[PDB]
């Protein structure tokens, strides 16, 4: 039985690879050689956010493009007003092992992660004068690594036990569980229409899942190391992943192929965060070499360097309108780039 | 001054938040943070028995001191990706049982030494000391006569006594340190008495804190 299953899987894998190779005749390397050159983008730190006493691991940008939440391992969760550098809220946390956080696209609820294998969704807009825990959602056997709000009630949570799940606030139970990852998942991204989502795992693969169907639909491969970052294209038919092999690869949900690889023979540092621009032309990614680099999305040529971090950068968020870029490093500082 | 009535109160609220966060961080810095780690079926419960989800925190108070241990035996995941949270800890407590030189899980002591020289010689741990605990001394006493140490280590060329075997184990465990110029390894033999087990922890931390302060100030 084992031999038959292995032979069938190998034969089908070759057929899938042959089908993929049958839809690749003109690579994007030669396609985008006829375009006006893009000048260097010089980004300056417009605003600096201070107040954190520990390393920052995740952050999310609000829909208003003015409120952002930063997750730090000092036991506090801070809502930042980027326009005037003001702390709207300072949420106390029972644990100081934060690894991820999320901001609902409503302004009422805020999520958080940790090493307790539990969800940390709080409520901000309440009759009381303090932020209280709305619901403690447990049921995961793996460390929190990523979480993102879809609706005001639905949320997709990524855990360290090589699986993902969809939770409900009132019930507190996994409505749908995503299983099939051979390795632990670390990050996920949400499509603009909030219908499909793709997550990156340590198994050097990123797989596309459907929230309504609750099963893996499309599988993407080509990376040489574990994937630590992922983000959808603004159009919604493509995405990019940041792995540890110092290369950024962009995968499109339509062609089921890798378009091009962002490589440079100067840095052997992995990518922690990946974000796009408003038009999907800038793909700046936060590397481990104490700074961030901006990569062109069509020519694979660097067109700007973001420096000024005293430690490795692990946070990178872009506003909904694509007007400001916020980076967060391990030096307990946040910088806004315009 | 280009600030409205609401902004004058928003900045005041931000200032109160900043002062509260600073006070909380100052209070948290006083407490001593320790990490508990060990191999398969390691005797990590001895410390919490003497003094008293994926991570559980145990805390207890001495005369003008505070401690907070962290246990990650429930993680069961890739250690290289959640170990970032444990940087800057005062010390790492490693629990190893001497009653493993003949038990087979490949020998258990081989796995314990692999874990020890993987965690000790790590990118993220080059400034934090490691405290080593040796458990089950009585069973080692009663089993050293039945079986010798040569079962585990083929290079042993000494008498099958207790002092020589203990010294050999200690130097074998301390020989895995390739960063002796920055990290020290404390080795103690755990006893039945609760005080004899944690007085060593107190003596270790009261020196590790001093060494870290001197190194940060530039005097060491």
């Amino acid at each position, epitope marked *: 039985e084992l031999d038959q299953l292995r032979q069938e899987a190998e034969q089908l894998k070759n057929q899938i690879r042959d089908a993929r190779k049958a839809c690749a005749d003109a690579t994007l390397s030669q396609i985008t050689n006829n375009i006006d050159p893009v000048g260097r983008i010089q980004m300056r730190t417009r605003r600096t956010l201070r107040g954190h006493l520990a390393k920052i691991y995740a952050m999310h940008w609000g829909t208003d493009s*003015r*409120l952002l939440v930063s997750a730090s391992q000092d036991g506090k969760l801070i809502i930042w*007003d980027s326009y005037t550098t*003001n702390k*709207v*809220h300072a949420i106390p946390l029972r644990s100081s092992w934060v690894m991820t956080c999320a901001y609902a696209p409503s*302004g009422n609820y805020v999520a958080c992660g940790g090493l307790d294998n539990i969800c940390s969704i709080y409520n901000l807009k309440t*009759r*009381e*004068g*303090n932020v209280r825990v709305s619901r403690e959602l447990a049921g995961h056997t793996g460390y929190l690594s990523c979480c993102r709000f879809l609706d005001d009630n639905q949320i997709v949570t990524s855990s360290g036990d090589t699986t993902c799940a969809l939770w409900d606030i009132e019930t507190g139970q996994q409505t749908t569980t995503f299983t099939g990852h051979t390795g632990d998942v670390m990050s996920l991204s949400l499509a603009p229409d909030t219908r499909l989502f793709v997550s990156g795992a340590c198994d050097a693969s990123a797989k596309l899942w459907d929230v309504r169907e609750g099963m893996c639909r499309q599988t993407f491969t080509g990376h040489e190391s574990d994937i630590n970052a992922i983000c959808f294209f603004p159009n919604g038919n493509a995405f990019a992943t940041g792995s540890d092999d110092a290369t950024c690869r962009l995968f499109d949900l339509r062609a089921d192929q890798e378009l091009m690889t962002y490589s440079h023979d100067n840095i052997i540092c992995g990518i922690t965060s990946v974000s796009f621009s408003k038009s999907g032309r800038l793909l700046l990614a936060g590397y481990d070499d104490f700074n961030c680099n901006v990569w062109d999305a069509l020519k694979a040529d660097r067109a700007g360097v973001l420096a000024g971090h005293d430690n490795r950068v692990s946070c990178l968020g872009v506003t909904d309108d694509g007007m400001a870029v916020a980076t967060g490093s391990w030096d307990s500082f946040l910088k806004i780039w315009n | 001054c*280009t600030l*409205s*009535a*609401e*902004d*004058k*109160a*928003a900045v*005041e*609220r931000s200032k*109160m938040i900043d002062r509260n966060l600073r006070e909380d961080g100052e209070k948290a810095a006083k407490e001593v943070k320790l990490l508990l780690l060990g191999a398969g079926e390691s005797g990590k419960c001895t410390i919490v028995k003497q003094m008293k989800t994926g991570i559980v925190e145990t805390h207890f108070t001495f005369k003008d001191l505070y401690f907070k241990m962290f246990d990650v035996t429930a993680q069961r995941s890739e250690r290289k990706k959640w170990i970032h949270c444990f940087e800057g800890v005062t010390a790492i407590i490693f629990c190893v049982a001497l009653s493993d030189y003949d038990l087979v899980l490949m020998n258990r002591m081989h796995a314990s030494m692999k874990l020890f020289d993987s965690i000790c010689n790590n990118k993220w741990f080059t400034e934090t000391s490691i405290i080593l605990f040796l458990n089950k001394k009585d069973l080692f006493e009663e089993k050293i006569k039945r079986s010798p140490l040569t079962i585990c280590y083929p290079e042993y060329t000494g008498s099958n006594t207790y002092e020589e075997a203990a010294a050999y184990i200690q130097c074998q465990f301390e020989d895995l340190n390739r960063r002796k110029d920055t990290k020290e390894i404390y080795t103690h033999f755990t006893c039945s008495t609760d005080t004899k087990n944690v007085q060593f922890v107190f003596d270790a931390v009261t020196d590790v804190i001093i060494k870290n302060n001197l190194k940060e100030c530039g005097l060491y």
Partner: single-chain antibody
Amino acid sequence: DVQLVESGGGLVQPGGSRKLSCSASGFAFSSFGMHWVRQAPEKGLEWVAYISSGSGTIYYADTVKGRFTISRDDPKNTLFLQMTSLRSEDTAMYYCVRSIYYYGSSPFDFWGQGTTLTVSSSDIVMTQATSSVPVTPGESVSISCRSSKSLLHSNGNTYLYWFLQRPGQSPQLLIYRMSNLASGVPDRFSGSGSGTAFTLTISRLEAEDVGVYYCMQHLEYPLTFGAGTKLELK
């Protein structure tokens, strides 16, 4: 369980001292600004004093400056308005008002039940065109009050507030910042403005939208209120 009970009041001779309390419960008394808005026995509202969270900034009105002391007890969740040299002017209805200030906050959201005190015998001015409008159930009401100065600020938002004081009750906030509906406000209420002229519209009021309408501004210390927009059931 949020409430603001006020203790103290009655008949006091002129030239004395009276003790007031605002013992609060149901919410955290450590991050809400405290107000002491006073309503005259006949009509009209005015701001007396305000203390921020943590007793940082303390503000006083011109008519009560030098004789009013305001303090709060954070552990006991109690607010005090001890006064000296009482005068027949200080014969009105005293209200204890909570408020919070941040990006997206709703100040003056809750008002106390009020206490009655009786004594034996460059500020922005808000003007209302009318004080009595004959209105029937299921009709459109246009309430407008003007401001002497331009309430528009450089940040791009307007600082205008609206209130509804039902008879035998306490004032209730309706619209804050001239474009945001308060909590519990129905879809019928709305608001509009241009910096100088502000309008308030009510559509299909059946029986609950009867009372005195108050509008104020949040731009300086005095915090002057409106006059009155009493509506008659005809």
